Design a protein around this ligand. Structure first.
Ligand SMILES: Nc1nc2ccc(Cl)cc2c2nc(-c3ccco3)nn12
Length: 286
């Protein structure tokens, strides 16, 4: 049905482009994820994205690419199957994660972004939907997915005001709202909003009354730029505000101090007396 040995299953959703299906590797007896893209699409991207995954073969928490080709009306990318997204798991946990789960996630999510940056790419759409847990023996590993909006950042790319937002407004950095070209800092500031999102259940710039699309964006930018970090993070450990302030202070072409940021949450993890056993909130559902 696909690539001689793959059976296409049911659609499970969409990425930044193309649609994702469940499938079966018939020869290996393993479930897989299959991404489809119309061959006649005006802006073909799937083969571009597969090159990025291929170049990240072997990275921790990077999905493995099993096959990439064309079939009928589609370009096809077959991937090892991953588990639920962090948004799915957040909902399954009643939109509340324990501090321990947030810190376990933060440690891995910072490392995933650092790895992407070490390969000269910026992700540009850091959000809960793009982090998936592994399945089975890899169920303790947070994976990052979807490089459809990713961009090579290096010789660093020049300072620019590449207007218009490509990623999601909810987690976009303030500099993105100002129309500045995204760089490494912006992936990390976005992660900072995702972590407070997990702590709060929502962000203060969600659900703002707006009539049209452009107005909706204005309201989000204005609320985000008028909400002090200390107000956003009030009631939660100071490390989250320290993290966001550090990212907001980074210069366009600065290499972030990833280790410092991981050690921030690590020291908190230790002061709480938590055990680093990968027992996340959802693992405790009976
Ligand atoms: N289970 C699953 N494994 C994957 C493995 C590799 C890659 Cl690269 C993507 C996915 C993937 N994407 C989605 C999805 C659901 C709704 C929208 O996208 N699920 N999914």
């Amino acid at each position: 049905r696909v690539g001689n040995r793959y059976r296409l299953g049911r659609k499970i959703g969409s990425g930044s482009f193309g649609d994702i299906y469940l499938g079966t590797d018939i020869a290996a007896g393993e479930e897989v994820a299959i991404k489809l893209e119309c061959v006649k699409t005006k802006h073909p991207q799937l083969h571009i994205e597969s090159k990025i995954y291929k170049m990240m073969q072997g990275g921790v928490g990077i999905p493995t690419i099993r096959w990439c080709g064309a079939e009928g009306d589609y370009n096809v990318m077959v991937m090892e199957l991953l588990g639920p997204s962090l948004e799915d798991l957040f909902n399954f946990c009643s939109r509340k994660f324990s501090l321990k789960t947030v810190l376990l996630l933060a440690d891995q999510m910072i490392s995933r972004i650092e790895y992407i940056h070490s390969k000269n790419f910026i992700h540009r759409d850091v959000k809960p939907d793009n982090f998936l847990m592994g399945l089975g023996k890899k169920g303790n590993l947070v994976y990052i997915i979807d490089f459809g909006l990713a961009k090579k950042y290096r010789q660093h790319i020049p300072y620019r005001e590449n207007k218009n937002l490509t990623g999601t407004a909810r987690y976009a950095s303030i500099n993105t709202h100002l129309g500045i070209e995204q760089s490494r800092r912006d992936d990390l500031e976005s992660l900072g909003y995702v972590l407070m999102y997990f702590n709060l259940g929502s962000l203060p710039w969600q659900g703002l009354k707006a009539a049209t699309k452009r107005q909706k964006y204005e309201r989000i930018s204005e609320k985000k730029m008028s909400t002090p970090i200390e107000v956003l993070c009030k009631g939660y450990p100071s490390e989250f505000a320290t993290y966001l302030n550090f990212c907001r202070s980074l210069r366009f072409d600065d290499k972030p101090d990833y280790s410092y940021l991981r050690q921030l949450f690590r020291n908190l993890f230790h002061r709480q007396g938590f055990s680093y056993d990968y027992v996340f909130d959802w693992n405790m559902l009976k």
